[PDB]
Amino acid sequence: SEYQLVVNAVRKLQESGFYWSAVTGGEANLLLSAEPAGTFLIRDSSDQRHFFTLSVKTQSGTKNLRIQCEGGSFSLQSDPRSTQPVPRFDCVLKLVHHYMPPQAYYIYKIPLVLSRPLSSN
């Protein structure tokens, strides 16, 4: 706890296969440019107060959603107009599952839908 929880969360995130080290926001755009909507990856944030950012190919182009790490649990940055509290997760696989609806939450009003992590090749 207090550091072990954080480092264990980071570790497991790094290990997940969703995570792309040494990829910028611009490079995420390139990687996701030719991919179908709902293709996503997690990468390092270039922001001072964030470790990680989720990049997702949406119906309306590539969007970026900062990941919050409070208490060593993960959540996606939430609009204060949310009527529900922010769901939070002790692992990234659960986070990702939560935002995989079948054909649901939205971004400012376009659906946020993850479907498949970006693969190498």
Binding site: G25, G26, A28, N29, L30, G61, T62, K63, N64, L65, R66, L76, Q77, S78, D79, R81, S82, T83, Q84, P85, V86, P87, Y99, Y105, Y106, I107, Y108, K109, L112
Partner: peptide, 11 residues
């Protein structure tokens, strides 16, 4: 590439 940020509406 323009890098656009968003937040999620949880409702």
């Amino acid at each position: 590439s323009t890098v656009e940020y968003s937040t999620v509406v949880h409702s």
